[PDB]
Amino acid sequence: VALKILIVEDDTDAREWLSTIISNHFPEVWSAGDGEEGERLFGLHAPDVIITDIRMPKLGGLEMLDRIKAGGAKPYVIVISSEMKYFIKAIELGVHLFLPKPIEPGRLMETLEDFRHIKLAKE
Amino acid sequence: ALKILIVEDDTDAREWLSTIISNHFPEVWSAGDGEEGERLFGLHAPDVIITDIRMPKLGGLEMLDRIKAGGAKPYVIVISAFSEMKYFIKAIELGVHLFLPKPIEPGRLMETLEDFRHIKLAKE
Ligand SMILES: [Mg+2]
Ligand SMILES: [Mg+2]
Numbered sequence A: 001v002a003l004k005i006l007i008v009e010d011d012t013d014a015r016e017w018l019s020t021i022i023s024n025h026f027p028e029v030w031s032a033g034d035g036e037e038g039e040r041l042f043g044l045h046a047p048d049v050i051i052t053d054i055r056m057p058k059l060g061g062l063e064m065l066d067r068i069k070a071g072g073a074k075p076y077v078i079v080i081s082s083e084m085k086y087f088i089k090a091i092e093l094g095v096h097l098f099l100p101k102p103i104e105p106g107r108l109m110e111t112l113e114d115f116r117h118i119k120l121a122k123e
Numbered sequence B: 001a002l003k004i005l006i007v008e009d010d011t012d013a014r015e016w017l018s019t020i021i022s023n024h025f026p027e028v029w030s031a032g033d034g035e036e037g038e039r040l041f042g043l044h045a046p047d048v049i050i051t052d053i054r055m056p057k058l059g060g061l062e063m064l065d066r067i068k069a070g071g072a073k074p075y076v077i078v079i080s081a082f083s084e085m086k087y088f089i090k091a092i093e094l095g096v097h098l099f100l101p102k103p104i105e106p107g108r109l110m111e112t113l114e115d116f117r118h119i120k121l122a123k124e
Helices: A012-023 A035-045 A061-069 A084-093 A105-120 B011-022 B034-044 B060-069 B085-094 B106-123
Strands: A005-008 A029-032 A049-052 A076-080 A097-099 B004-007 B028-031 B048-051 B075-078
Touching (some): A005 A012, A005 A035, A012 A105, A029 A035, A035 A049, A035 A061, A049 A061, A076 A105, B004 B011, B004 B034, B011 B028, B011 B106, B028 B034, B034 B048, B034 B060, B048 B060, B060 B085
Parallel strands (some): A005 A049, A049 A076, A076 A097, B004 B028, B004 B048, B048 B075
């Protein structure tokens, strides 16, 4: 019933910051540095929420999502957001939220709080 | 004629830095980690290094140390938004010419790069 969160950010500093802030309120938190690790961690822990970068090494956040969405799963998705092409594809994929960098902590935590309330309602 | 090497693990910031700089400097290289950064330095001997500190494989400071140990003396700009006093201390020992933490101020970056270009000019 706990909200499981997966963070996919290629920047070491930003990834660890996200992880630290989030784990302070949510125990089930995992983080990856590219779309491949991200896809593996997703299959391994089936997180409820995915917070992911778009441009990343090895595999982009959108190709990663497509591979995930193309497996049945329908997690809540927060996108860490320069070209309209990315946005548009992010819509086809079904992205739920777009968070502008520098990531704003309150908005993020507030959004996750919203995601849990929704999870309980359906458990 | 100022050759610049950018080392940053975040793709977005790395590509942004490459774009805004390439607009006014024709010789720019970008690396995603200290190891790749080190290899590119050895290949193209750039005059300027713009590097982050914490990255995969090899960190900016360790990278810088290896490059210096080899005898090169490039101008160095550190773009890390670190959280300790120890990174700063080691950075200064190695000899950094400018700390431009995130979020990066393009204006401050351009002026500094022009200063370096002038130094390489006056020195020919
Ligand atoms: Mg970085
Ligand atoms: Mg990134």
